[PDB]
């Protein structure tokens, strides 16, 4: 997206991971009785040149998770549960209502978050949080020039490496902070299918199929990532899938892990 930090720094960043947009979880900062919160944004790429737009906004405050998803007009998720608007959560200390075609979250301690279920996100903080927050939005200290900084406080080499330091926790094998020219894409609706069994599932570490013996010798993620994108790009084509799986078997054999009869257990005979 195009971003505008609390302190007014305009920058572009096209990472497709889930990022810490604003948080009080800032190493080496005192909190002074401020209520803690975290706003995260999951991005989604499209096109080539690769750009990204926000697809999920998540607000974690007062022991509650409110996420707001693209195209789910009139609805939020309270702790993963789809919910109509308006709604009051966290003991009536947080409220979300629909206004002027956007979801407007407001909290008693002053956090304001809005998302229009498309790709505009706004985060507004009371003056008390000056210098007390961090993430992609910076530290809100009226200085726009020190906002591109690691969690540990030191300047970052590049925008994409800075954004990577601010990824939120959670496995996201297909995401990246920057696309170095030649980068596949895949619609998020086709993702669960291609990641599960019958497709690239065997190359994911828990799914318990014919390749689990090799997972600990040839870490599968890079093959998994390549499977889902090669398959998703090929419209789910079986022969792309089988080739990608056979290349993991080749790497496994070179590591001394034999995998006989695999084709029969994944239908690649």
């Amino acid at each position: 997206p195009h971003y505008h930090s609390f302190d007014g720094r305009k920058f572009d960043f096209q990472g497709t991971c889930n990022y810490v947009l604003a948080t009080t979880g800032c190493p080496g900062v005192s909190t002074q009785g401020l209520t803690p919160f975290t706003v995260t944004t999951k991005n989604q790429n499209r096109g080539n040149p690769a750009v990204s737009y926000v697809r999920v906004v998540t607000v974690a405050a007062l022991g509650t998770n409110i996420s707001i998803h693209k195209d789910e007009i009139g609805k939020v998720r309270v702790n993963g549960v789809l919910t109509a608007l308006p709604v009051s959560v966290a003991d009536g200390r947080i409220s979300v209502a629909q206004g002027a075609s956007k979801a407007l979250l407001v909290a008693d301690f002053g956090l304001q978050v809005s998302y229009d279920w498309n790709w505009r996100v706004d985060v507004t903080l009371p003056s008390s949080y000056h210098g007390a927050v961090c993430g992609l939005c910076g530290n809100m200290d009226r200085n726009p020039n020190n906002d591109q900084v690691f969690p540990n406080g030191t300047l970052a080499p590049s925008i994409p490496i800075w954004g990577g330091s601010w990824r939120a926790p959670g496995w996201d094998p297909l995401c990246w902070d920057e696309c170095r020219g030649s980068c596949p894409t895949c619609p998020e609706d086709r993702l669960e299918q291609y990641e599960g069994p019958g497709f690239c599932g065997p190359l994911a570490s828990g799914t318990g199929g014919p390749f689990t013996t090799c997972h600990a010798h040839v870490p599968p993620e890079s093959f998994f990532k390549g499977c889902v994108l090669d398959v998703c790009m090929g419209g789910g084509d079986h022969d792309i899938l089988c080739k990608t799986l056979a290349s993991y078997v080749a790497a496994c054999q070179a590591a001394g892990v034999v995998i006989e009869d695999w084709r029969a257990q994944v239908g690649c005979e």
Partner: peptide, 10 residues
């Protein structure tokens, strides 16, 4: 005064 971080696109 309150301050605002926003984003849109791309």
């Amino acid at each position: 005064a309150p301050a605002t971080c926003w984003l849109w696109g791309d």
